[PDB]
CSV table of C-alpha atoms in Angstrom, one decimal:
chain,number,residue,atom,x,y,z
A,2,UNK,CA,0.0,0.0,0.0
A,3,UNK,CA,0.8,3.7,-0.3
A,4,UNK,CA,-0.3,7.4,1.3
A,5,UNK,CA,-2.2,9.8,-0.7
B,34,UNK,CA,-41.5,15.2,2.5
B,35,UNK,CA,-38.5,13.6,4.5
B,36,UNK,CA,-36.8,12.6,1.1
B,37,UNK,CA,-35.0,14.4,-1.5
B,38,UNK,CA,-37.2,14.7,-4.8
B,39,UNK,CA,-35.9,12.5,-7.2
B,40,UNK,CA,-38.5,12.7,-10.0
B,41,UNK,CA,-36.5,14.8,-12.8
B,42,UNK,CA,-35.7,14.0,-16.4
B,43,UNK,CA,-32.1,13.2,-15.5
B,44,UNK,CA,-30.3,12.1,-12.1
B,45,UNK,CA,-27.0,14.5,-12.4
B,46,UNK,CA,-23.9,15.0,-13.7
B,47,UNK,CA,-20.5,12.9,-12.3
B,48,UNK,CA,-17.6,14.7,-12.6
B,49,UNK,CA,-14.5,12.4,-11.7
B,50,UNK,CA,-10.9,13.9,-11.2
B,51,UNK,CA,-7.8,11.2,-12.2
B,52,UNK,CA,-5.2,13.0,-11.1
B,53,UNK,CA,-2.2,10.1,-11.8
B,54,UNK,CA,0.6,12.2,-12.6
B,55,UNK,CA,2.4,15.5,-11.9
B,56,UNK,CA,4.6,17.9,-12.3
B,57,UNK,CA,8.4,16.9,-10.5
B,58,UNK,CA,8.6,20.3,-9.0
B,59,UNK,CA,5.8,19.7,-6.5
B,60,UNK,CA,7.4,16.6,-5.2
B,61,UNK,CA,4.6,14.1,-5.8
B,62,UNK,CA,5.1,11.1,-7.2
B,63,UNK,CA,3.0,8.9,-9.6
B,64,UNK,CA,-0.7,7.8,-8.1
B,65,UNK,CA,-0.3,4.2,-9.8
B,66,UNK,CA,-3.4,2.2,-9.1
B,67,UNK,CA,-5.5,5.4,-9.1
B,68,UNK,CA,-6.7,4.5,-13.0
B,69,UNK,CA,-8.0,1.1,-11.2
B,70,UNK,CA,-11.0,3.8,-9.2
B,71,UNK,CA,-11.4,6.3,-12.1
B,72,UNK,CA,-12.8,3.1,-14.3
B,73,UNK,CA,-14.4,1.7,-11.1
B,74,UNK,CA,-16.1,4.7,-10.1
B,75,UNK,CA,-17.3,5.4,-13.2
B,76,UNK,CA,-18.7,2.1,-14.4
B,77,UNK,CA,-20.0,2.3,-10.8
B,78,UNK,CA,-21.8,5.7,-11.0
B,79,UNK,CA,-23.3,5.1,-14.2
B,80,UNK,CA,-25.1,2.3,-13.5
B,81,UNK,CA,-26.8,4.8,-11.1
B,82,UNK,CA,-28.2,6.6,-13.8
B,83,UNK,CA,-25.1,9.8,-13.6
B,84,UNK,CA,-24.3,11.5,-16.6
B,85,UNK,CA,-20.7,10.7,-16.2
B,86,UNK,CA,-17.6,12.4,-17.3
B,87,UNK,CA,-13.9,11.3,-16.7
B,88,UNK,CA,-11.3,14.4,-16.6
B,89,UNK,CA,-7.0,13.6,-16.2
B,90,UNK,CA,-4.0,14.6,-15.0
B,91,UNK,CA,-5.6,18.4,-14.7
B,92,UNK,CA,-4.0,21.8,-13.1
B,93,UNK,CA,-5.0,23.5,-10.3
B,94,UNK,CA,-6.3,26.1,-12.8
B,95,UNK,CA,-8.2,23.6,-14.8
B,96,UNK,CA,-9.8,21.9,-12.3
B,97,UNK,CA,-10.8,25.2,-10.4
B,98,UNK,CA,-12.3,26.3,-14.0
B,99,UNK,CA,-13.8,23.0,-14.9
B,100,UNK,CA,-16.3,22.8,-12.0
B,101,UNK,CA,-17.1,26.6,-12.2
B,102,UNK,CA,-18.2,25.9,-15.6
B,103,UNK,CA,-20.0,23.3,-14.0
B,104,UNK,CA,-21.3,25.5,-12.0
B,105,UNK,CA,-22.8,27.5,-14.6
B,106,UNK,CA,-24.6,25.1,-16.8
B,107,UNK,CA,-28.3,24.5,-16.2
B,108,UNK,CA,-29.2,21.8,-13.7
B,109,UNK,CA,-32.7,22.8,-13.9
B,110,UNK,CA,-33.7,19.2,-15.0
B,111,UNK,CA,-31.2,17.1,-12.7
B,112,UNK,CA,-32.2,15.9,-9.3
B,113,UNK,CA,-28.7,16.3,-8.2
B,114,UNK,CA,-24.9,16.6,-8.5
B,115,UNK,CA,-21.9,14.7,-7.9
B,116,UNK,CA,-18.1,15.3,-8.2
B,117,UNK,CA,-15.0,12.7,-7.4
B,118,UNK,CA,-11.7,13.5,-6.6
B,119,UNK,CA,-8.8,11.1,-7.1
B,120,UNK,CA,-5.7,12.7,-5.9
B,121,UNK,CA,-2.9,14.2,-3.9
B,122,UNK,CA,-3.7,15.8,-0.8
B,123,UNK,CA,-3.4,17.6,2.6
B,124,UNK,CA,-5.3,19.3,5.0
B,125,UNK,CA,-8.0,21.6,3.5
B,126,UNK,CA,-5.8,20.9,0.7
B,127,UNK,CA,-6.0,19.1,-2.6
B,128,UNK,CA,-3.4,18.6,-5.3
B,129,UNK,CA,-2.9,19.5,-8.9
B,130,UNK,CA,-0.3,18.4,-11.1
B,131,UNK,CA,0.1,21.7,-11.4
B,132,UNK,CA,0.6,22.2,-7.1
B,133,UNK,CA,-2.0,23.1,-4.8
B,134,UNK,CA,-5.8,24.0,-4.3
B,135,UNK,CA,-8.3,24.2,-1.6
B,136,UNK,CA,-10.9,21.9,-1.0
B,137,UNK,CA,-13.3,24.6,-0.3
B,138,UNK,CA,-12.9,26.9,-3.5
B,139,UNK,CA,-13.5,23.7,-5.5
B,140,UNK,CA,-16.9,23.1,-3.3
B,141,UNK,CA,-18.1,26.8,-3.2
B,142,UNK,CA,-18.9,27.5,-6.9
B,143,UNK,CA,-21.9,25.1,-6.1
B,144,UNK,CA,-23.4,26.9,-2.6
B,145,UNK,CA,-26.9,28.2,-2.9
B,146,UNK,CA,-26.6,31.7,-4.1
B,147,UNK,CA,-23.7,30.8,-6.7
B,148,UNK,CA,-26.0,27.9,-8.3
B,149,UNK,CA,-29.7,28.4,-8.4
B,150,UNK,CA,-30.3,25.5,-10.4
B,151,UNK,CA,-28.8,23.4,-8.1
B,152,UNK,CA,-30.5,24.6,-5.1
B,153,UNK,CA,-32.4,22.4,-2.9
B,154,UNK,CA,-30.9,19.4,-4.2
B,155,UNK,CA,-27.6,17.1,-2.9
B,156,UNK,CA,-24.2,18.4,-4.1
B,157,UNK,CA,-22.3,15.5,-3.6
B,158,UNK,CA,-18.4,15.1,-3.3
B,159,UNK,CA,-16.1,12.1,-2.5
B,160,UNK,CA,-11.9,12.7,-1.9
B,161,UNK,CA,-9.5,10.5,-2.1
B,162,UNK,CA,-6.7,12.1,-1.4
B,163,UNK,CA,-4.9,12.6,2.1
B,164,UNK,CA,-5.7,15.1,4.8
B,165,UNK,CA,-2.6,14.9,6.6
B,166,UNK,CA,0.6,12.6,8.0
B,167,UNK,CA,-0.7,10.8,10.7
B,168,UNK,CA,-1.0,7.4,10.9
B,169,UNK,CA,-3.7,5.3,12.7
B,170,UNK,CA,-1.7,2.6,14.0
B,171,UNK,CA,-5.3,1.0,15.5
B,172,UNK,CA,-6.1,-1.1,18.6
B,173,UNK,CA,-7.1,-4.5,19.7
C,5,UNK,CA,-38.6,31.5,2.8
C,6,UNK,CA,-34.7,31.8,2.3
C,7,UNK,CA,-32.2,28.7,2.3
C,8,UNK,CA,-28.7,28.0,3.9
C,9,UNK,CA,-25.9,28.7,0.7
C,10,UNK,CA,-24.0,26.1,2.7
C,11,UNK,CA,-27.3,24.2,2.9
C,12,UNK,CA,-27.6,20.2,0.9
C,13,UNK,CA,-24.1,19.5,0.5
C,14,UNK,CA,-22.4,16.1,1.7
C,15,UNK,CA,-18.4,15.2,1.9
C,16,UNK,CA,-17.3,12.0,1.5
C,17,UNK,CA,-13.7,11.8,3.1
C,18,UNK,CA,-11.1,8.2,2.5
C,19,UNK,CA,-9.9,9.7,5.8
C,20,UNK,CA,-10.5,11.9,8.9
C,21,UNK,CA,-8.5,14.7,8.8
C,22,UNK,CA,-4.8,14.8,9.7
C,23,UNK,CA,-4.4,11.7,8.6
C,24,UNK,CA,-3.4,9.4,5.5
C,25,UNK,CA,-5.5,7.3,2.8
C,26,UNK,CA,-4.6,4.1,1.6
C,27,UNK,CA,-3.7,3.0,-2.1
C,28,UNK,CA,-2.8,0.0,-3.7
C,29,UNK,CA,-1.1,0.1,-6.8
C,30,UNK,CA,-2.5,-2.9,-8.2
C,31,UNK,CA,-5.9,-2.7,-6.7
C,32,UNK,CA,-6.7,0.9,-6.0
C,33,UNK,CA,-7.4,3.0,-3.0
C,34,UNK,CA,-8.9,1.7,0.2
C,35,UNK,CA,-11.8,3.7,0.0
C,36,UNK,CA,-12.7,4.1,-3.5
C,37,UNK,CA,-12.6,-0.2,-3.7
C,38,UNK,CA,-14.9,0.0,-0.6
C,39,UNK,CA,-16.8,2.5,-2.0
C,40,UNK,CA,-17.5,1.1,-5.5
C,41,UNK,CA,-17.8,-2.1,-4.0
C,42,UNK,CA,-21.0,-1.4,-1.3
C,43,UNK,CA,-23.0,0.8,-4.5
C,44,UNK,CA,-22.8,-2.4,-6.8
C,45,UNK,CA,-24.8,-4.3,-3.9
C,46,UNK,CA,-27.3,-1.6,-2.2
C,47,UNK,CA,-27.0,1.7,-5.2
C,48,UNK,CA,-30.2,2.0,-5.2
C,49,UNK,CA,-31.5,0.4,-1.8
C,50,UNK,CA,-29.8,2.2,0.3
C,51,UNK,CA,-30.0,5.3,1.7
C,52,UNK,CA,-27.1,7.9,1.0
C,53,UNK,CA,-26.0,8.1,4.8
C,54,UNK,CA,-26.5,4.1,5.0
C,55,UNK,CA,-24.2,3.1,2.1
C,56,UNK,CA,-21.2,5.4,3.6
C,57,UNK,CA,-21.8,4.0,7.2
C,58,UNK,CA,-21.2,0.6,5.9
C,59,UNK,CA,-18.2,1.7,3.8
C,60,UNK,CA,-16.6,3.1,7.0
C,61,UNK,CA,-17.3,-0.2,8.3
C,62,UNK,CA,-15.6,-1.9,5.4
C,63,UNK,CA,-12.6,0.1,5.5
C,64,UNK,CA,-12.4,0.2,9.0
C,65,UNK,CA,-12.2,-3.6,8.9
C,66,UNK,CA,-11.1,-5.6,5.9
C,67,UNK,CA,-8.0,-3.9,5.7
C,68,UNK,CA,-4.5,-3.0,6.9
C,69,UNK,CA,-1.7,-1.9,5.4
C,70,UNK,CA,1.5,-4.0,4.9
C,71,UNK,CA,4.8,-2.5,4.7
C,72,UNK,CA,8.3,-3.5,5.9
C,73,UNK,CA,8.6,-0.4,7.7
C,74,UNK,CA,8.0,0.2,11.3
C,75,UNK,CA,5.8,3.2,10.7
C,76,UNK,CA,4.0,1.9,7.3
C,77,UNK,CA,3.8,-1.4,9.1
C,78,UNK,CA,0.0,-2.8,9.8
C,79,UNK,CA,-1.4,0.9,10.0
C,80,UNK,CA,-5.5,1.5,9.9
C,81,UNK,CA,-7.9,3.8,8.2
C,82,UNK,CA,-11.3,5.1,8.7
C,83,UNK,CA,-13.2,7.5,6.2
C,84,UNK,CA,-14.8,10.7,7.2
C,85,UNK,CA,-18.8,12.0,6.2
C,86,UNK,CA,-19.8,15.5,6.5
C,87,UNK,CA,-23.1,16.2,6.2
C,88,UNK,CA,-25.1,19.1,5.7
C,89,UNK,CA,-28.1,17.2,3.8
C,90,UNK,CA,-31.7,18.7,5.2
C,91,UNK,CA,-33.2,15.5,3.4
C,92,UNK,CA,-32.6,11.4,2.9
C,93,UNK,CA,-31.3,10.7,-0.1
C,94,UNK,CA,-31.8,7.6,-2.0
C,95,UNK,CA,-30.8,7.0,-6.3
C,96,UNK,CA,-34.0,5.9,-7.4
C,97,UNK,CA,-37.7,5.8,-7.3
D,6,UNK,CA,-7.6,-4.3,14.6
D,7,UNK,CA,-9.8,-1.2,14.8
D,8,UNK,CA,-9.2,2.8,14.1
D,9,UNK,CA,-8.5,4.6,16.9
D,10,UNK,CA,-10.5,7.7,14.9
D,11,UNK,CA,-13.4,4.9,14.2
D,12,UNK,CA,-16.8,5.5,16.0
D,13,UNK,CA,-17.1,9.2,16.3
D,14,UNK,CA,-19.8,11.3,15.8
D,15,UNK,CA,-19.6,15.0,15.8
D,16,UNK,CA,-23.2,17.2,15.3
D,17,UNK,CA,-21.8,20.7,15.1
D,18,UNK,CA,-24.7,23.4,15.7
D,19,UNK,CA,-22.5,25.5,12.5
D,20,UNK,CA,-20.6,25.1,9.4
D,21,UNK,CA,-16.8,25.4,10.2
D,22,UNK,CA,-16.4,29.7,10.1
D,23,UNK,CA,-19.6,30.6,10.4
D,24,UNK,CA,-22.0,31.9,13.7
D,25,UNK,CA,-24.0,30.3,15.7
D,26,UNK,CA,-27.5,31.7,16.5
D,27,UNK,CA,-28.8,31.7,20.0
D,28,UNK,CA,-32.0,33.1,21.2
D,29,UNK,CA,-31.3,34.7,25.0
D,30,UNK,CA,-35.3,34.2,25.3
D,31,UNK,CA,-36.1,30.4,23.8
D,32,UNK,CA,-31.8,29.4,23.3
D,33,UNK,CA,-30.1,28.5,20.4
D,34,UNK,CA,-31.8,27.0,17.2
D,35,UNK,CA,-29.8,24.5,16.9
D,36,UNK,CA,-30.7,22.8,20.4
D,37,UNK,CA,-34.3,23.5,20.0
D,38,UNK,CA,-34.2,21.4,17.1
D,39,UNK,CA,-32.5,18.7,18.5
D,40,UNK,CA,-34.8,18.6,21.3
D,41,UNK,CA,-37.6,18.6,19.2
D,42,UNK,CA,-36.4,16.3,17.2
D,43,UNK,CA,-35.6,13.9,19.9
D,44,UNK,CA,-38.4,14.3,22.5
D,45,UNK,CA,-40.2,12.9,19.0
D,46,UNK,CA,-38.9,10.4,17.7
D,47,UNK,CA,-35.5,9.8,19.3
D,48,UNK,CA,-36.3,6.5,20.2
D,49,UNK,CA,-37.3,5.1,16.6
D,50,UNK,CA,-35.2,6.7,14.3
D,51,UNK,CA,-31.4,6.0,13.6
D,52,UNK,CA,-29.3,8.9,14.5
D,53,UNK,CA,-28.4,9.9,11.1
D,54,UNK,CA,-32.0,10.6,10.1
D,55,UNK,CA,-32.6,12.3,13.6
D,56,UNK,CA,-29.6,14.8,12.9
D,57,UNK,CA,-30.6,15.2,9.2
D,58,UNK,CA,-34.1,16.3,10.6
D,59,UNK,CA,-32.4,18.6,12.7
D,60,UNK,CA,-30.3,19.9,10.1
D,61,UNK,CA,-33.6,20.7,7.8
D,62,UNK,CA,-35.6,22.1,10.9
D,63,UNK,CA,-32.9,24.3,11.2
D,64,UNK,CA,-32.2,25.4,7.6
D,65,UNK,CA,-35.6,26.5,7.4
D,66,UNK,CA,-38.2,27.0,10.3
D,67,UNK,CA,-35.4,30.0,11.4
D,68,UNK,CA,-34.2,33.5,10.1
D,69,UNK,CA,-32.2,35.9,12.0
D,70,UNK,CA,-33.8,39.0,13.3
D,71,UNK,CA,-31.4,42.3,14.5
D,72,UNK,CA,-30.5,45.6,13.8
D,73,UNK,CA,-27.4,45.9,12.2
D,74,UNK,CA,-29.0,45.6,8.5
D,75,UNK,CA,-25.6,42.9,8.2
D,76,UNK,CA,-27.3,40.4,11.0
D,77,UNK,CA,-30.4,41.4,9.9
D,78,UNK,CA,-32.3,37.7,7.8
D,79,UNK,CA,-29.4,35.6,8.5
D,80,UNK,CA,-29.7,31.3,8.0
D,81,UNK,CA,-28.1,28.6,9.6
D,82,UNK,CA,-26.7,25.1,8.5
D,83,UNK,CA,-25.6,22.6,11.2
D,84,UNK,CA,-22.8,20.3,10.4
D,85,UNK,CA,-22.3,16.4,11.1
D,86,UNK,CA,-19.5,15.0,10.9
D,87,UNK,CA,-19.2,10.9,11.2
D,88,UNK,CA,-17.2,8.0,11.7
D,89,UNK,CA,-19.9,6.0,12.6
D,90,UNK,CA,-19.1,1.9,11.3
D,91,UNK,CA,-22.5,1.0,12.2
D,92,UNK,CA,-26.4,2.0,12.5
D,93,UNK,CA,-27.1,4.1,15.5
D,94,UNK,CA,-30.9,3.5,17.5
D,95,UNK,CA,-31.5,4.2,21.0
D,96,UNK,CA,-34.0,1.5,22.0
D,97,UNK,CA,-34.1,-2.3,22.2
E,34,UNK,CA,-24.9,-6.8,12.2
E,35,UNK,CA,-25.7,-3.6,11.0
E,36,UNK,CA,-26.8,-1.5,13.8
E,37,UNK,CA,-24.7,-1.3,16.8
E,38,UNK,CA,-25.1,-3.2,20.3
E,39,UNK,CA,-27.2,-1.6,22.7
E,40,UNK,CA,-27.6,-4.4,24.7
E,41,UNK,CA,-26.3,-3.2,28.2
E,42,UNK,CA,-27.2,-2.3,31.7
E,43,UNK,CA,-26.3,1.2,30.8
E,44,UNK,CA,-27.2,3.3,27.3
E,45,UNK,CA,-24.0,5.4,28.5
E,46,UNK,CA,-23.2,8.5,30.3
E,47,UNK,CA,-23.8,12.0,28.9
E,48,UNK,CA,-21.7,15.2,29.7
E,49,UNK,CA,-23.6,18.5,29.4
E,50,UNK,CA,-21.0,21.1,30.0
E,51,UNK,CA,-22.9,24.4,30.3
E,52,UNK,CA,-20.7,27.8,29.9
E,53,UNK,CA,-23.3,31.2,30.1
E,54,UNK,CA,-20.3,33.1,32.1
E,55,UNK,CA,-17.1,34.4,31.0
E,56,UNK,CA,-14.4,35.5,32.7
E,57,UNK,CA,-13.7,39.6,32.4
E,58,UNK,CA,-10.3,38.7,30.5
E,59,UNK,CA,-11.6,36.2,27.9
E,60,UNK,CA,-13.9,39.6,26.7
E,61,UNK,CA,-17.3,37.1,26.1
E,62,UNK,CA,-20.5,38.3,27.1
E,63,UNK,CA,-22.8,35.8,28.8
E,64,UNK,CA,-24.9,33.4,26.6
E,65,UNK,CA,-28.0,34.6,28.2
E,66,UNK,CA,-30.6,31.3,27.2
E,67,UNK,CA,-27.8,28.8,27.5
E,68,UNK,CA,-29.9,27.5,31.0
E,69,UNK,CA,-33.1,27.5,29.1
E,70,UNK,CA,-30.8,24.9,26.4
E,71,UNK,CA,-29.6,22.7,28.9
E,72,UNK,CA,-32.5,22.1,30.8
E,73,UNK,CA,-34.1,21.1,27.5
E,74,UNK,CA,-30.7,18.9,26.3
E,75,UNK,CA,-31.1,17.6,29.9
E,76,UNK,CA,-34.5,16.4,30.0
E,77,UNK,CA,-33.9,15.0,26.2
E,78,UNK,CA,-31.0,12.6,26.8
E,79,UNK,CA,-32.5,11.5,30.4
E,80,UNK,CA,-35.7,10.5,28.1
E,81,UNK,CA,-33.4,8.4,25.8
E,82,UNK,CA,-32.1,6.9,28.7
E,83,UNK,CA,-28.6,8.8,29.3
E,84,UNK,CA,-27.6,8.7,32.5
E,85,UNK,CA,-26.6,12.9,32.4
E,86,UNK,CA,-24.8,15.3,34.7
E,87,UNK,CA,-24.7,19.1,33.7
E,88,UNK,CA,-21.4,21.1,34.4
E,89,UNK,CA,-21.3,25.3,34.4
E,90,UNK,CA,-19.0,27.7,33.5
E,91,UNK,CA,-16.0,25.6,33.3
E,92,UNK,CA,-12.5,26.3,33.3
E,93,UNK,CA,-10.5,25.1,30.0
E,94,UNK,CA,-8.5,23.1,32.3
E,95,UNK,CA,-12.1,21.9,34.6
E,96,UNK,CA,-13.4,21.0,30.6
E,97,UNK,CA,-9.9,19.1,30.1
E,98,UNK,CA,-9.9,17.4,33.6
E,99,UNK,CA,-13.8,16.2,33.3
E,100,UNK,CA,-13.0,14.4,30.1
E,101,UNK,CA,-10.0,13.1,30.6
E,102,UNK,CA,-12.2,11.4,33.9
E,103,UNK,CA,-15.0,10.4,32.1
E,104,UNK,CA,-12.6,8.5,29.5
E,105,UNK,CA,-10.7,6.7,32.4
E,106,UNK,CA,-14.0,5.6,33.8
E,107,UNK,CA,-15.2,2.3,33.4
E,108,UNK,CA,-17.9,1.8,30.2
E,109,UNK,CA,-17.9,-1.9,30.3
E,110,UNK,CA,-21.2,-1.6,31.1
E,111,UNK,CA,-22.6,1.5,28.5
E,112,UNK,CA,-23.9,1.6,25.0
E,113,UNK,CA,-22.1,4.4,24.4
E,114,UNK,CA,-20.7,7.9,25.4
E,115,UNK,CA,-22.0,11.3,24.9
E,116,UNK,CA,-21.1,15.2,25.7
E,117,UNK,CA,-22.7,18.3,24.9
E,118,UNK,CA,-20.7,21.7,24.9
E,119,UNK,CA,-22.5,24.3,25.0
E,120,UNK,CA,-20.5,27.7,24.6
E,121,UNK,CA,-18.4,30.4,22.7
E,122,UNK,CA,-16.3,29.3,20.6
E,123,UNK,CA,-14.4,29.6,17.1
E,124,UNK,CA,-12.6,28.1,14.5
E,125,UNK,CA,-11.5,24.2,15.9
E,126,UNK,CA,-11.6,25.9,19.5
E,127,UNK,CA,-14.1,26.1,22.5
E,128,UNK,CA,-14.3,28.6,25.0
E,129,UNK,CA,-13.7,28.2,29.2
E,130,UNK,CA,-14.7,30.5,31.4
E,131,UNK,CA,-11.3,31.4,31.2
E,132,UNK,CA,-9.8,31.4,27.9
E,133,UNK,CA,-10.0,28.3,25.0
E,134,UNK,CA,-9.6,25.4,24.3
E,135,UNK,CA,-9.1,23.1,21.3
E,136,UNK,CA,-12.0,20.8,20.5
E,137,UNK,CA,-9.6,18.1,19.5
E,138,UNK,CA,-8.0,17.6,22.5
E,139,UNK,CA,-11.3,17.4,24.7
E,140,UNK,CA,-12.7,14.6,22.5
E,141,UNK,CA,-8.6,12.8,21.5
E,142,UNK,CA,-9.5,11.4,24.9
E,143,UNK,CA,-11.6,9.1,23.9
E,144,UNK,CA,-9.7,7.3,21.1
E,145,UNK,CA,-10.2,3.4,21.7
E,146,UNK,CA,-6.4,3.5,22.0
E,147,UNK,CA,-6.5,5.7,24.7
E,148,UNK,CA,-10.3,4.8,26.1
E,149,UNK,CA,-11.1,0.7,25.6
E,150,UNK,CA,-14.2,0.3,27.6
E,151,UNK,CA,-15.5,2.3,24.4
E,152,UNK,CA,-14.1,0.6,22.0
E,153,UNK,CA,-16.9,-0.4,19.0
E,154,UNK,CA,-18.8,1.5,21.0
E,155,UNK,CA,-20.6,5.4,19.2
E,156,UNK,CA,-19.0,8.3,21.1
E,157,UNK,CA,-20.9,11.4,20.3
E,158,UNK,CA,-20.0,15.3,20.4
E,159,UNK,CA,-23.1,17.9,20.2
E,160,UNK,CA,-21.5,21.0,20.3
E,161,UNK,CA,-23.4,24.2,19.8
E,162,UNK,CA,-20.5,27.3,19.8
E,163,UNK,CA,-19.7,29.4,16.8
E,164,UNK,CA,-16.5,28.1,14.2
E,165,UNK,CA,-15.7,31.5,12.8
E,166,UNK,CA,-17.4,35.0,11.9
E,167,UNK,CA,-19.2,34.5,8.1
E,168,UNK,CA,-23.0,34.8,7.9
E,169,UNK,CA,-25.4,33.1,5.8
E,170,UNK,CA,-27.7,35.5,3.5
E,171,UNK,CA,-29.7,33.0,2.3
E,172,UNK,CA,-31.3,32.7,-1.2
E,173,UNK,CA,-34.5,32.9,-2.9
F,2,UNK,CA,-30.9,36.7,18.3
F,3,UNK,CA,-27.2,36.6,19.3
F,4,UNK,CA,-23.9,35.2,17.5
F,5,UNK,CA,-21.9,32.2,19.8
């Protein structure tokens, strides 16, 4: 997963 | 009565922002998987009887323009609006290729007084983008 | 009479403020999957407020993020609604 | 594993930067609503559709009323914010 | 399922902080009505079954120190949690008797990483103050 | 009618  | 009148000609307009890319000066880095919503949502939001329109990698400027413009058509006929953003964020803040916009100018070309045809009826918007740096670690 | 300006609009938020939002780049964010996912079943069943609720509940569940990082490791999320509807809302009928 | 941010409900009597209006002879408008609202049907409706109530009752029924022509016919939206995972009823 | 729990002994405690005077410095003038409010809140939530207590004119740090309490009490046995503010206030803040205080950190108490007896469980807010200076006109 |  990754932050937006 | 306690519902929102839903018997017009057309349900709305769908706006839906893929922002995937941007510029290297704002330090953002490729949204990859962000395509994967845009076709969700819009598959999704059709099916629900939205006039849906898909808009990409778009400036500040653009996207500031693009739902003013909105704004202005003629929603006389619609029982409602809808816009979907799919991008970079912060607090308040939302991102452009281009850099950085607020949340709120996006929203206000739509308030009561600035959109008489869309008065009385849901404005509806959904962000995906992030509102900060904290992370919820969770419990149990 | 008159009407709020700031009257029948609704915010639907991946995150509470502060905070991150989730993305996979293979399957998509969090919230938009969740999202998509709960109007397929209950679109036009459900009531606006109802069909959020349960996609906080989905997010809030179902997943957690896996990194191999001590601060990206096993993190949460749980979206956000701001309401300022006068009226339920359903997409049909 | 839950949110720690998960299960919160926030009914704000205002939009974030605006005023609130209180009546020093039957209170604020906001809280008559509520009550209304709830000594009604707050024990058969879920608290979404309570607050949403509220939030029309609100929107319409009142309209400022003072001197200085710029607080003079003046509205007022309340605000809910939710994290809310579940359906909220206060009975059974 | 779908709804939540409220299968217990208790349907929860509920806070009703009641602030109608100001100290000289914080330059408020009294929210004359704000009794005639919580007497109605109070009789409300004691209908839905809330087992309330009202508090008046409370300090920022009295506010602080009652719900940082309340969230160490034990809620094993409650539905669910909720407070009422009832005061001046602004932008993210809430006003003591003597001065502000942010809204965040009277309800950050309550996280379920910091409050587990209400964990899963609603935690609700009614707070009636102002969050800035704009009006609403109105339209049409 | 007063502003809070």
């Amino acid at each position: 997963y990754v932050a937006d | 009565t306690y519902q929102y009148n839903m018997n017009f000609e057309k349900l709305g307009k769908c706006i839906i922002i893929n922002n995937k890319n941007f510029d290297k000066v704002t330090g953002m880095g490729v949204r990859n998987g962000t395509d994967k919503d845009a076709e969700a949502l819009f598959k999704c939001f059709r099916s629900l009887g939205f006039d849906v329109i898909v808009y990409n990698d778009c400036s500040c400027a653009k996207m500031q323009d693009l739902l003013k413009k909105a704004s202005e058509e003629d929603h006389t006929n619609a029982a409602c609006f809808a816009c979907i953003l799919l991008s970079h964020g912060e607090e308040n803040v939302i991102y452009g290729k281009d850099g950085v916009t607020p949340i709120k100018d996006l929203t206000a070309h739509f308030r009561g007084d600035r959109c008489k045809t869309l008065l009385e009826k849901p404005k509806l918007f959904f962000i995906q983008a992030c509102r900060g740096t904290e992370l919820d670690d969770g419990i149990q | 009479y008159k009407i709020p300006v700031e009257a029948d609009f609704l915010f639907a938020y991946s995150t509470v403020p502060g905070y991150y939002s989730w993305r996979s780049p293979g399957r998509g964010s969090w919230f938009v999957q969740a999202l998509c996912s709960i109007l397929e079943e209950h679109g036009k069943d459900l009531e606006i407020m109802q069909i959020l609720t349960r996609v906080n509940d989905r997010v809030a569940r179902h997943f957690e993020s896996q990194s191999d990082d001590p601060h990206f490791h096993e993190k949460k999320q749980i979206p956000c609604v701001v309401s300022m509807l006068t009226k339920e809302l359903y997409f049909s009928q």
